[PDB]
Design a protein around this ligand. Structure first.
Ligand SMILES: [Ca+2]
Ligand SMILES: [Ca+2]
Ligand code: NA
Lengths: 223, 58
């Protein structure tokens, strides 16, 4: 997260870290046994880390649970990044309390201008490299489909949406993928891609979760 | 033809932080870099062994 702020220990209880020997992606806990992340976050030997703040130190509220299943959307396109969503089943059910909790799925799509919370342990620099120990947060608005398409000609599908600030300086970055974009207590997006990070006229692109609610519910229920 | 082993490492547009290897011709060794998760170029390997086998001596 570039241009954000320190969330505070366990203030984003649904945020998880996907670990494969190190942190490589984020995710959102939707129930005690399931996590929503990005399809490009599929990787061998995933271990989901819940209740994390400082990802480099054992603080006492962590739950490390291996992925028992990783279901990438059947229509995921690795070239265009369309349908960039993946469901991860936890080998054992996570213990939910205040520090480890699920985030509700949306009942409807969020409108342009809606302020949301984006979080993750990704790069905090637009130019260069600096990975944080603790969880970073960013308040950013959903942007119009028209502005998103103008920013990325011929790259935005009906399953993607832009969020952020066109002047640059605030955005999600490498290491944030798969993480949450929560608006009014609902999971509306999954960190997906963008042209660099926090660059002017290049807002972050996110998977439109509101388009997959039925698929998410049915898929979880059938696995 | 152009040697893909001599191309600079490519992170790509996706936002994952996946550690991969690339052959650094200037240093003469396989080094680590951050791959975003999509649109990988060929000078991108999952291990130092894969990198050396493919680009060693480039
Ligand atoms: Ca920790
Ligand atoms: Ca290196
Ligand atoms: Na802490």
């Amino acid at each position: 997260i570039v241009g954000g702020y320190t969330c505070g220990a366990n203030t984003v209880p649904y945020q998880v870290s996907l670990n494969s020997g190190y942190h490589f992606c984020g995710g959102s806990l939707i129930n005690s046994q399931w996590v929503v992340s990005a399809a490009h976050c599929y990787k061998s030997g995933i271990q989901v880390r819940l209740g994390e703040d400082n990802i480099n130190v054992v603080e006492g509220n962590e739950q490390f649970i291996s992925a028992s299943k990783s279901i990438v959307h059947p229509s995921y396109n690795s070239n265009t990044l369309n349908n960039d969503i993946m469901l991860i089943k936890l080998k054992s059910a996570a213990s939910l309390x205040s520090r480890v909790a699920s985030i509700s799925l949306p009942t409807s799509c969020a409108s342009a201008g809606t302020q949301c919370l984006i979080s993750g342990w990704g790069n905090t620099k637009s130019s260069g490299t600096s990975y944080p120990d603790v969880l970073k947060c960013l308040k950013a608005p959903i942007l119009s489909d028209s502005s998103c398409k103008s920013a990325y000609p011929g790259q935005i599908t009906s399953n993607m949406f832009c969020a952020g600030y066109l002047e640059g300086g605030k955005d999600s970055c490498q290491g944030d993928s798969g993480g949450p974009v929560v608006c009014s207590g609902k999971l509306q997006g999954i960190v997906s891609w963008g042209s660099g990070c926090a660059q002017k006229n290049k807002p972050g692109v996110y998977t439109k979760v509101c388009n997959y609610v039925s698929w998410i519910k049915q898929t979880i229920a059938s696995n | 033809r152009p040697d893909f082993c001599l191309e600079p490492p490519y992170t790509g547009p996706s936002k994952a932080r996946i550690i991969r290897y690339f052959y650094n011709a200037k240093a003469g060794l396989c080094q680590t870099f951050v791959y975003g998760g999509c649109r990988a170029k060929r000078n991108n390997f999952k291990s130092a062994e894969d990198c050396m086998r493919t680009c060693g001596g480039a």
